[PDB]
Design an enzyme around this catalytic site. Structure first.
Site, PDB file in Angstrom:
ATOM      1  N   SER A  43       0.825  -1.242   0.000  1.00 22.23           N
ATOM      2  CA  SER A  43       0.000   0.000   0.000  1.00 22.23           C
ATOM      3  C   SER A  43       0.830   1.249   0.000  1.00 22.23           C
ATOM      4  O   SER A  43       0.367   2.240  -0.600  1.00 22.23           O
ATOM      5  CB  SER A  43      -0.902  -0.119   1.255  1.00 22.23           C
ATOM      6  N   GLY A  70      -1.426  -4.710   1.484  1.00 25.29           N
ATOM      7  CA  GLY A  70      -1.284  -5.984   2.199  1.00 25.29           C
ATOM      8  C   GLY A  70      -0.243  -6.943   1.662  1.00 25.29           C
ATOM      9  O   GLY A  70       0.030  -7.919   2.387  1.00 25.29           O
ATOM     10  N   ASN A 100       4.897  -5.750   5.539  1.00 22.91           N
ATOM     11  CA  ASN A 100       3.754  -6.667   5.850  1.00 22.91           C
ATOM     12  C   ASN A 100       4.162  -8.095   6.093  1.00 22.91           C
ATOM     13  O   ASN A 100       3.243  -8.932   6.287  1.00 22.91           O
ATOM     14  CB  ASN A 100       2.750  -6.682   4.668  1.00 22.91           C
ATOM     15  N   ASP A 188      -2.324   6.499  10.513  1.00 22.92           N
ATOM     16  CA  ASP A 188      -2.471   5.330  11.359  1.00 22.92           C
ATOM     17  C   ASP A 188      -1.123   4.745  11.752  1.00 22.92           C
ATOM     18  O   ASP A 188      -1.081   3.565  12.136  1.00 22.92           O
ATOM     19  CB  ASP A 188      -3.385   4.315  10.638  1.00 22.92           C
ATOM     20  N   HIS A 191       0.580   3.986   7.312  1.00 27.57           N
ATOM     21  CA  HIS A 191       0.226   4.561   6.004  1.00 27.57           C
ATOM     22  C   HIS A 191       0.513   6.056   6.024  1.00 27.57           C
ATOM     23  O   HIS A 191       0.253   6.719   7.056  1.00 27.57           O
ATOM     24  CB  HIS A 191      -1.225   4.265   5.599  1.00 27.57           C
TER      25      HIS A 191
END
Lengths: 212, 212
Positions: A43, A70, A100, A188, A191
């Site tokens: 992402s 992801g 990830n 967050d 991101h």
């Protein structure tokens, strides 16, 4: 096997087939277009196309964005093996993945990144590869910061002796003196916000221009 | 128990504590601010704050965005019970969640949405509640479209008799005649592009203005 370097698609356990739709879109993109630069990763890559302007920096360079939220290294490896590098002859491939890879050690993640570079070097030998470092994450100090740092060390060491393979630390210093990451930079704490993207994209863009 | 209506936090299996950081940020937001409107839900809520302008429609209404990507109904229920409704007295609470409730039936998801409305009705009885329908997802026809439609039917039926509870279908017709959703609207066939957000946000904004 290192799970990070064994190519495998994401298994659909939800039922709407979105990951394979994305892969198929990208395959079609490569079939129909002639990029100079293709970006691939998670992402952090994907949302650059939205959430940074992409249009002012990267659009002019004739670029395709094959980010998928992801993905882990092994998923990017599968996608490159299974169609996304066909029909094209890019000058540069930009890779950004490994944050990830939960449950993989930092050394395993590094092996996945090294495997991606090797596949690109085989399928698209004319291309230079740019690997971005994994950014810090989490509001406060935590094991994934140390992990990500250790991947970056190991990847940087692996690529140092590689003429047309380039490691780029794009982190402008998101971890402040008090150990925290600002939600103004990462909404967050993973991101990037638009503001977070600016320094990252600036740094990438500079490198791309040099190379190109 | 219906798992969709049993409040539970997201368990950290990655190690960086981001979900609890977000919750704690929102708790602090509610402690320190005095919103007229609070938005809560999943990434469709969260990324409205970035990826639509938020600033031109919703900022003027004195709004807090407590969206978190990946949340299911039970996670939103826990967050509302555990601090995010304290210290405030909003006129409206906007709820948008249930697309991530994988492994729950459409009736269970509806029970989770109904539980959220009831908690808001208890803790913030003066507030009107707006529930958004679940949008379609997936590039082509698939079981989650039918699921999401069936939640929307059941939620709409549940809220019809509720004076200050309002169901809003914000879908302008993202599923085309050929069964497909355009990546111009949802870049990954789930998450909205800026273009996707415009009609959604327009529709919400109209309703909010009516109510307010």
């Amino acid at each position: 096997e290192n799970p990070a370097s064994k190519p495998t698609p994401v298994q659909d356990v939800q039922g709407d087939g979105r990951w394979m739709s994305l892969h198929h879109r990208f395959v079609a993109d490569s079939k129909d277009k002639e990029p100079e630069v293709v970006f691939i990763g998670d992402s952090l890559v994907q949302l650059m196309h939205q959430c940074e302007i992409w249009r002012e920096l990267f659009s002019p360079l004739h670029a395709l964005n094959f980010g998928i939220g992801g993905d882990s290294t092994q998923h990017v490896l599968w996608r490159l093996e299974n169609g996304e590098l066909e029909h094209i002859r890019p000058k540069i491939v930009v890779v950004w993945v490994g944050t990830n890879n939960h449950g993989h050690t930092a050394e395993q993640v590094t092996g996945g990144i090294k495997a991606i570079v090797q596949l690109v070097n085989e399928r698209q030998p004319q291309a230079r590869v740019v690997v971005l470092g994994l950014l810090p994450r989490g509001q406060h100090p935590n094991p994934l910061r140390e992990k990500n740092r250790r991947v970056n060390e190991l990847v940087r060491a692996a690529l140092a002796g590689h003429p047309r393979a380039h490691f780029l630390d794009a982190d402008p210093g998101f971890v402040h003196s008090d150990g925290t990451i600002s939600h103004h930079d990462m909404y967050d704490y993973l991101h990037l916000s638009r503001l977070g993207y600016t320094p990252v994209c600036r740094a990438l863009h500079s490198l791309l221009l040099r190379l190109l």
